[PDB]
Design an enzyme around this catalytic site. Structure first.
Site, mmCIF file in Angstrom:
data_model
loop_
_atom_site.group_PDB
_atom_site.id
_atom_site.type_symbol
_atom_site.label_atom_id
_atom_site.label_comp_id
_atom_site.label_asym_id
_atom_site.label_seq_id
_atom_site.Cartn_x
_atom_site.Cartn_y
_atom_site.Cartn_z
ATOM 1 N N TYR A 361 0.791 -1.241 0.000
ATOM 2 C CA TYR A 361 0.000 0.000 0.000
ATOM 3 C C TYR A 361 0.821 1.288 0.000
ATOM 4 C CZ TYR A 361 -3.795 3.323 0.776
ATOM 5 O OH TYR A 361 -4.649 4.382 0.686
ATOM 6 N N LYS A 365 1.078 4.006 -2.963
ATOM 7 C CA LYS A 365 0.796 5.442 -2.909
ATOM 8 C C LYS A 365 1.959 6.236 -3.526
ATOM 9 C CE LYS A 365 -1.134 7.424 0.694
ATOM 10 N NZ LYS A 365 -2.407 7.886 0.064
ATOM 11 N N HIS A 432 -2.640 -3.962 5.973
ATOM 12 C CA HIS A 432 -4.109 -3.879 5.982
ATOM 13 C C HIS A 432 -4.744 -5.249 5.751
ATOM 14 C CE1 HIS A 432 -3.884 0.542 5.944
ATOM 15 N NE2 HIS A 432 -2.875 0.368 5.105
ATOM 16 N N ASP A 440 -8.328 -5.906 0.082
ATOM 17 C CA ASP A 440 -7.912 -4.680 -0.608
ATOM 18 C C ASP A 440 -7.026 -4.856 -1.824
ATOM 19 O OD1 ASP A 440 -9.096 -3.708 1.710
ATOM 20 O OD2 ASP A 440 -7.346 -2.610 2.390
ATOM 21 N N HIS A 444 -4.628 -1.907 -3.520
ATOM 22 C CA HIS A 444 -3.165 -1.927 -3.562
ATOM 23 C C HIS A 444 -2.669 -2.065 -4.989
ATOM 24 C CE1 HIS A 444 -2.562 -3.264 0.892
ATOM 25 N NE2 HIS A 444 -3.616 -2.478 0.749
ATOM 26 N N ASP A 504 -13.069 -6.762 2.160
ATOM 27 C CA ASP A 504 -12.586 -7.840 3.042
ATOM 28 C C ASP A 504 -12.661 -9.217 2.355
ATOM 29 O OD1 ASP A 504 -11.800 -8.077 6.187
ATOM 30 O OD2 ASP A 504 -12.799 -9.926 5.463
ATOM 31 N N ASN A 514 -17.561 -5.293 3.927
ATOM 32 C CA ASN A 514 -17.505 -3.829 3.929
ATOM 33 C C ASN A 514 -16.655 -3.264 2.796
ATOM 34 O OD1 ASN A 514 -15.152 -4.758 6.056
ATOM 35 N ND2 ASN A 514 -14.605 -2.925 4.924
ATOM 36 N N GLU A 516 -14.613 0.639 2.339
ATOM 37 C CA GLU A 516 -14.327 2.003 2.774
ATOM 38 C C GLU A 516 -14.017 2.915 1.580
ATOM 39 O OE1 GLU A 516 -10.622 3.147 5.008
ATOM 40 O OE2 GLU A 516 -12.082 3.743 6.531
ATOM 41 N N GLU A 520 -10.670 4.458 -4.246
ATOM 42 C CA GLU A 520 -9.554 3.565 -4.597
ATOM 43 C C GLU A 520 -9.979 2.368 -5.464
ATOM 44 O OE1 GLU A 520 -7.369 3.151 -0.869
ATOM 45 O OE2 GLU A 520 -5.831 4.531 -1.604
ATOM 46 N N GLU A 673 0.504 15.939 7.370
ATOM 47 C CA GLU A 673 -0.433 15.856 6.234
ATOM 48 C C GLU A 673 -1.517 16.931 6.294
ATOM 49 O OE1 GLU A 673 -0.243 11.061 6.243
ATOM 50 O OE2 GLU A 673 -1.489 11.871 4.624
ATOM 51 N N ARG A 678 -0.331 12.531 1.953
ATOM 52 C CA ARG A 678 0.981 11.953 1.614
ATOM 53 C C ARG A 678 1.040 11.156 0.294
ATOM 54 N NH1 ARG A 678 -0.503 8.431 5.844
ATOM 55 N NH2 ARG A 678 -0.558 6.244 5.207
HETATM 56 O O1 LIG Z 1 -1.796 10.198 8.575
HETATM 57 C C1 LIG Z 1 -1.218 9.269 9.502
HETATM 58 C C2 LIG Z 1 -2.127 8.057 9.634
HETATM 59 O O2 LIG Z 1 -2.321 7.530 8.328
HETATM 60 C C3 LIG Z 1 -3.006 6.307 8.245
HETATM 61 O O3 LIG Z 1 -2.943 5.850 6.898
HETATM 62 C C4 LIG Z 1 -4.202 5.876 6.205
HETATM 63 C C5 LIG Z 1 -4.523 4.456 5.840
HETATM 64 O O4 LIG Z 1 -4.772 3.803 7.057
HETATM 65 C C6 LIG Z 1 -5.751 4.369 4.987
HETATM 66 O O5 LIG Z 1 -5.911 2.994 4.697
HETATM 67 C C7 LIG Z 1 -7.114 2.741 3.979
HETATM 68 C C8 LIG Z 1 -7.776 1.478 4.498
HETATM 69 O O6 LIG Z 1 -8.516 1.769 5.688
HETATM 70 C C9 LIG Z 1 -8.593 1.102 3.287
HETATM 71 O O7 LIG Z 1 -9.863 1.724 3.021
HETATM 72 O O8 LIG Z 1 -8.051 0.498 2.177
HETATM 73 C C10 LIG Z 1 -6.835 1.186 1.878
HETATM 74 C C11 LIG Z 1 -5.616 0.376 2.363
HETATM 75 O O9 LIG Z 1 -5.686 -0.998 1.943
HETATM 76 C C12 LIG Z 1 -6.870 2.629 2.459
HETATM 77 O O10 LIG Z 1 -7.926 3.378 1.831
HETATM 78 O O11 LIG Z 1 -5.575 5.129 3.821
HETATM 79 C C13 LIG Z 1 -5.356 6.517 4.073
HETATM 80 C C14 LIG Z 1 -5.230 7.219 2.726
HETATM 81 O O12 LIG Z 1 -4.256 6.575 1.887
HETATM 82 C C15 LIG Z 1 -4.107 6.721 4.943
HETATM 83 O O13 LIG Z 1 -3.936 8.091 5.327
HETATM 84 C C16 LIG Z 1 -2.361 5.243 9.112
HETATM 85 O O14 LIG Z 1 -3.200 4.094 9.080
HETATM 86 C C17 LIG Z 1 -2.257 5.742 10.533
HETATM 87 O O15 LIG Z 1 -1.602 4.783 11.370
HETATM 88 C C18 LIG Z 1 -1.459 7.017 10.529
HETATM 89 O O16 LIG Z 1 -1.427 7.461 11.884
HETATM 90 O O1 LIG Z 2 -12.334 -5.303 6.401
HETATM 91 C C1 LIG Z 2 -11.477 -4.856 5.363
HETATM 92 C C2 LIG Z 2 -10.653 -3.719 5.946
HETATM 93 O O2 LIG Z 2 -9.925 -4.262 7.057
HETATM 94 C C3 LIG Z 2 -9.096 -3.311 7.742
HETATM 95 O O3 LIG Z 2 -8.322 -3.852 8.813
HETATM 96 C C4 LIG Z 2 -9.122 -4.348 9.867
HETATM 97 C C5 LIG Z 2 -8.399 -3.987 11.170
HETATM 98 O O4 LIG Z 2 -8.288 -2.574 11.281
HETATM 99 C C6 LIG Z 2 -9.039 -4.670 12.404
HETATM 100 O O5 LIG Z 2 -10.327 -4.175 12.739
HETATM 101 O O6 LIG Z 2 -9.144 -6.071 12.172
HETATM 102 C C7 LIG Z 2 -9.898 -6.416 11.013
HETATM 103 C C8 LIG Z 2 -9.960 -7.928 10.939
HETATM 104 O O7 LIG Z 2 -10.401 -8.330 12.199
HETATM 105 C C9 LIG Z 2 -9.277 -5.872 9.733
HETATM 106 O O8 LIG Z 2 -10.062 -6.281 8.619
HETATM 107 C C10 LIG Z 2 -8.079 -2.713 6.798
HETATM 108 O O9 LIG Z 2 -7.310 -1.720 7.512
HETATM 109 C C11 LIG Z 2 -8.789 -2.082 5.597
HETATM 110 O O10 LIG Z 2 -7.808 -1.574 4.686
HETATM 111 C C12 LIG Z 2 -9.688 -3.112 4.910
HETATM 112 O O11 LIG Z 2 -10.396 -2.532 3.807
#
Ligand SMILES: OC[C@H]1O[C@@H](O[C@@H]2[C@@H](O)[C@H](O[C@@H]3[C@@H](O)[C@@H](O)O[C@H](CO)[C@H]3O)O[C@H](CO)[C@H]2O)[C@H](O)[C@@H](O)[C@@H]1O
Ligand SMILES: OC[C@H]1O[C@@H](O[C@@H]2[C@@H](O)[C@@H](O)O[C@H](CO)[C@H]2O)[C@H](O)[C@@H](O)[C@@H]1O
Length: 752
Positions: A361, A365, A432, A440, A444, A504, A514, A516, A520, A673, A678
C-alpha cells in the site's frame, strides 16, 4: 521449483522466508503471513475459491457469521439457520459525538430458525455451490443434511432436506394468518410478515404453537412486503422454482458508451410446471437504471426497507440495467492558467518524496504519485524530469515483479506469491491484512497498474507480455479475472448484484462485508482501462469499463446518496464512509479527524476522478456540511484534497484557499499531512485546480465513440479532451455533434 517465470518477471510458488528488516512490532510481523488453511466448502466446490463476497463468512467460519442476503439477514448455527428482518423498530442511528462518528445499523436478532427434524446440532456449514450472487450453504451431520439457497436480491430462501423434514422454530408463537394447507402466511409477534411454502399435499402443523412443522423434504421461505393474500399468491407462483444458476452478463457499446447488464436466473422446478423464473428484489442502483423492456415486470408496491433504502420486486427470468460510461483520461491536459515556472518548481520539489513504508500500500501510494507527476512534467517541457520519474517506476516494478534474486533463490521482500490453497496473488511486505485476510487487492494493486499504464503509454516495449506485461496482467487477473481463469476466481473484488466492491476477503463480521475507499476501487478500474488501451486488450478494457460504470452507479446511491432517498433524515453527515452489508458508518478504519471521513472516498485524484463531479448539487451539499462542521476552511488534515474537491463546483474558492496555504508546505514531510496528503503533491494540486478553473464543470450529458475522453462545460462553452493510445489517427464523434481528429500517441483538445 520455488517460482514461476512470467516473461522477464516471476512469482513465488513457495511461501518466502520474510525479511522483516528488524521490526519487532507484533502487528507488522503478523501481516506477513497467509490466509486461513481451512476452507469450509464441500467436495463439489473446487479450484480457486471465491473471496470478497457478501457470503464469505460461511467459507471461513465453521458455521457463518451474520449475513445480509437483502432483504433478509441470516446466520448459520449448529441448530439451523436463523432468519431475521430489520423492521423500523430494529433500526437505530448511533453516534459518538466527541469522536464525530455516526452509525446506521440494525439488530442481530432471530425471527425464526429453519431446522431439520432429525438433528439438534450440525457439525458445520459449508459452501456447497455459488454463482454470480446466490450461494448454497450446506449444514451437514452424516446422513442428515439441510441445504439452503439464498442470495442478495432474493426474497426467497429455498430449503432442501436429506433424511429429514422441515421445522420452523420461534421463541414466541407466530400468528398464522393464512393457512392454505401446504402454504402458510404468518407474522412474528412483532408484526413482520413471511410465508412458507411446501409442495402440494404436504400440510403444515403446529399452527398456534412455537414450532411449525411439515413432513416435506423441500420448503421455501419468503419475506412478504405486506400482509396480503395477493402477494402471498404471487410468491406461491415462484416458490417451487429454486435458483441454481445466476449470471450477470454485460455488454459495452463502443458508439454510445452504454453499459448494458442482464441479470438472469435458471431454476429447477420442485413441482410439476413451476415456471423458469423468480421474484428479484432490486436495489436502488438497479431500478433507477432499468431498461425500458424490464419496466413491465416491476412490482411497484412490493417494497422492502433495508440499510440501502427501498428495494422493489420484479418478476421473471431476467432483468436489464443500462448505464453510461463517461470516459476516463490518463491525466488532465495542459489547460490551466498556472504560473508555469512555479509548477515546474513543484515538480522538482517532488523528487524529495519517498515511500513511507515498505508494504504494497505505501509503496503503491508512492508510485501513484510518481505516475501522476510524469505527464505533468511532459506538459511542462521538463523531459529530463519526466524520464527520471518513469525511470524510477520501471526500477520499482522490475524489482517487485521478480520473485527471485540473481542466483534464483526467493527474495524476502518486494515480491508476489501465489497462495494455492485459496488461489490468490499475495504481495510482501503486506499491510491492511492484504495477505492474511486477502483484503484490498484492487486498492493496492491498482497503484501498480497505474505505474505500469504510465510506462506503457511511453514505452510499449517494456509492457509486452514477454517483458514486464505478463506480470502486470497477472496482478490484474488476481483482482478482476474473467470466467474460467485457472488461477483465480471470477471478478474477485466485485459483487455484480450489490453493484460494488467488497474489500474484506473473509467477510467475518456480523455486519457482513464492507468497503471504505470507493475512490480507490474506481482508481483500480480506471487504471486497468488505461493499461488495456495502452497494451491493446479490448476484452480487458471492456471488463474494466463495466466495473467502473457499475461501481459509479452504486457510489452515487450508497456512499453519496445524491438523490436523497437512502440515508435517514436524522443522519447528519452528507456521506457514508464505510458501507457494510447490514450497516453504514461515518467512521474510518484508523483514528481520523473530520476531513478524512469524507475524503477517503475522493482520493486519490487522477484522470478517472471526474465521476466525482457529475452531481454538482451533491458536491456543494457535501463540501458545505464538511465546512460547517469544521467551522471554517481551516481543514484538520488533507487540505489539498478538499481544495481539489471544491474545484468541481467553485474553482475560484478552491484557488483562493490554495493560494493562502499551499506554500506553507516545503519539501516532502511524511509526518505532517495538514496541507498535502501523503499520496499527493503540490504539483498535482496546483495543476488540478488551475485546469478545473479553466475548464469549468464536468459535463456528463455528452458521450463519445471512444473510451478515453472527457467533456467540460464552462457557462455554455464546452471543451473536449481526447487521448489516442493507438499508432493510428482517429476521429472521435461526440453525442452533441462535435468531432475531433487525434494523432497517434497523443492528446487533442477542441472547443464548441
Ligand atoms: O496520517 C497518519 C495516519 O495515516 C493512516 O494511513 C491511512 C490508511 O490507514 C488508509 O488505509 C485505507 C484502508 O482503511 C482502506 O480503506 O483500504 C486502503 C488500504 O488498503 C486505504 O484506503 O488510507 C489513508 C489514505 O491513503 C491513509 O492516510 C495510518 O493508518 C495511521 O496509522 C497514521 O497514523
Ligand atoms: O475489512 C477490510 C478492511 O480491514 C481493515 O483492517 C481491519 C483492522 O483494522 C481490524 O479491525 O481487524 C480487522 C480484521 O479483524 C481488519 O479487517 C483494513 O485496515 C482495511 O484496509 C480493509 O479494507
Amino acid at each position: 521449483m520455488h517460482a514461476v517465470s512470467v516473461g522477464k518477471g516471476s512469482y513465488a510458488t513457495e511461501f518466502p522466508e520474510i525479511d522483516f528488516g528488524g521490526i519487532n512490532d507484533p502487528g507488522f510481523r503478523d501481516q506477513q503471513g497467509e490466509p486461513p488453511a481451512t476452507i469450509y466448502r464441500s467436495d463439489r466446490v473446487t479450484g480457486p475459491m471465491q473471496t470478497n463476497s457478501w457470503w464469505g463468512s460461511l467459507a471461513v467460519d465453521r458455521f457463518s457469521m451474520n449475513q445480509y442476503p437483502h432483504p433478509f439477514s441470516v446466520r448459520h448455527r449448529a441448530e439451523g439457520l436463523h432468519v431475521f428482518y430489520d423492521a423500523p423498530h430494529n433500526m437505530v442511528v448511533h453516534e459518538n459525538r466527541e469522536a464525530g462518528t455516526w452509525h446506521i445499523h440494525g439488530a442481530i436478532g432471530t425471527d425464526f430458525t429453519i431446522k431439520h427434524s432429525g438433528t439438534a446440532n450440525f457439525e458445520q456449514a459449508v459452501v456447497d455451490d455459488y454463482n454470480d450472487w446466490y450461494v448454497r450453504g450446506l449444514l451437514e451431520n452424516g446422513a442428515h443434511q439441510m441445504a439452503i439457497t439464498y442470495g442478495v436480491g432474493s426474497p426467497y430462501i429455498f430449503v432442501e432436506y436429506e433424511d429429514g423434514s422441515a421445522v420452523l422454530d420461534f421463541d414466541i408463537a407466530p400468528d398464522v394468518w393464512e393457512m392454505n394447507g401446504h402454504v402458510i402466511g404468518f407474522s412474528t409477534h412483532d408484526h413482520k410478515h413471511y410465508a412458507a411454502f411446501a409442495p402440494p399435499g404436504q400440510n403444515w402443523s403446529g399452527i398456534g404453537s412455537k414450532t411449525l412443522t411439515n413432513n416435506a423434504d423441500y420448503i421455501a421461505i419468503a419475506k412478504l412486503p405486506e400482509k396480503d393474500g395477493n402477494m402471498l399468491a404471487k410468491f406461491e407462483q415462484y416458490a417451487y422454482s429454486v435458483v441454481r444458476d445466476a449470471v450477470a452478463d454485460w455488454t459495452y457499446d463502443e458508439a454510445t458508451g452504454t453499459v448494458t447488464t442482464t441479470f438472469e436466473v435458471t431454476t429447477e422446478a420442485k413441482v410439476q410446471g413451476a415456471p423458469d423464473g423468480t421474484i428479484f428484489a432490486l436495489y436502488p442502483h438497479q431500478y433507477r437504471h432499468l431498461a425500458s423492456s424490464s419496466e413491465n415486470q416491476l412490482l411497484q408496491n412490493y417494497q422492502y426497507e433495508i440499510i440501502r433504502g427501498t428495494m422493489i420486486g420484479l418478476e421473471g427470468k431476467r432483468f436489464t440495467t443500462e448505464l453510461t460510461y463517461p470516459g476516463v483520461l490518463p491525466s488532465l491536459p495542459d489547460l490551466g492558467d498556472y504560473d508555469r515556472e512555479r509548477l515546474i518548481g513543484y515538480l522538482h520539489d517532488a523528487t524529495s518524496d519517498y515511500p513511507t513504508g515498505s508494504d504494497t500500500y505505501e509503496l503503491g501510494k508512492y508510485i501513484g504519485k510518481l505516475a501522476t507527476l510524469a505527464p505533468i512534467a511532459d506538459q511542462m517541457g521538463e523531459y529530463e524530469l519526466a524520464e527520471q520519474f518513469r525511470g524510477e517506476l520501471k526500477d520499482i516494478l522490475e524489482d517487485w515483479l521478480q520473485a527471485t534474486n540473481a542466483s534464483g533463490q526467493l527474495k524476502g521482500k518486494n515480491l508476489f506469491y501465489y497462495n494455492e490453497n485459496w488461489g490468490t496473488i499475495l504481495g510482501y511486505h503486506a499491510a491492511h491484512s492484504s495477505a492474511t485476510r486477502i483484503n484490498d487487492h484492487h486498492f493496492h494493486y491498482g497503484y501498480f497498474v497505474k505505474a505500469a499504464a504510465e510506462i506503457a503509454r511511453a514505452d510499449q516495449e517494456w509492457a509486452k507480455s514477454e517483458n514486464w506485461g505478463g506480470m502486470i496482467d497477472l496482478l490484474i487477473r488476481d483482482f478482476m479475472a474473467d470466467r474460467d481463469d485457472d488461477l483465480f476466481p471470477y471478478l474477485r473484488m466485485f459483487d455484480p448484484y450489490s453493484g460494488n466492491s467488497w474489500a474484506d476477503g473473509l467477510a467475518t463480521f456480523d455486519a457482513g462485508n464492507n468497503q471504505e475507499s470507493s475512490s480507490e476501487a474506481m482508481h483500480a478500474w480506471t487504471n486497468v482501462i488505461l493499461w488495456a488501451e495502452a497494451t491493446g486488450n479490448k476484452a480487458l478494457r471492456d471488463r474494466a469499463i463495466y466495473l467502473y460504470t457499475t461501481e459509479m452507479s452504486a457510489i452515487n446511491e450508497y456512499f453519496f446518496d445524491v438523490h436523497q432517498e437512502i440515508f435517514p433524515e436524522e443522519y447528519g453527515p452528507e456521506i457514508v464512509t464505510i458501507n457494510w452489508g447490514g450497516k453504514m458508518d461515518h467512521a474510518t478504519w484508523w483514528n481520523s479527524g473530520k476531513v478524512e471521513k469524507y475524503a477517503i472516498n475522493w482520493l486519490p485524484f487522477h484522470g478517472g476522478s471526474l465521476y466525482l463531479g457529475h452531481h454538482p448539487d451533491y458536491v456543494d451539499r457535501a463540501y458545505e456540511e464538511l465546512r460547517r462542521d469544521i467551522g471554517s476552511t481551516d481543514w484538520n488534515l488533507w487540505s489539498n484534497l478538499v481544495w481539489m474537491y471544491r474545484a468541481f463546483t467553485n474553482p475560484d474558492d478552491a484557488l483562493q484557499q490554495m493560494e493562502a496555504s499551499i506554500d506553507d508546505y516545503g519539501l516532502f514531510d511524511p509526518g505532517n499531512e495538514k496541507i498535502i496528503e501523503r499520496g499527493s503533491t503540490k504539483a498535482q494540486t496546483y495543476h488540478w485546480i488551475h485546469n478545473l478553473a479553466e475548464l469549468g464543470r464536468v459535463d456528463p450529458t455528452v458521450t463519445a465513440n471512444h473510451p478515453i475522453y472527457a467533456v467540460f462545460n464552462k457557462n455554455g462553452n464546452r471543451t473536449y479532451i481526447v487521448y489516442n493510445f493507438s499508432d493510428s489517427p482517429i476521429t472521435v464523434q461526440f453525442s452533441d455533434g462535435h468531432s475531433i481528429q487525434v494523432e497517434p500517441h497523443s492528446f487533442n483538445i477542441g472547443n464548441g
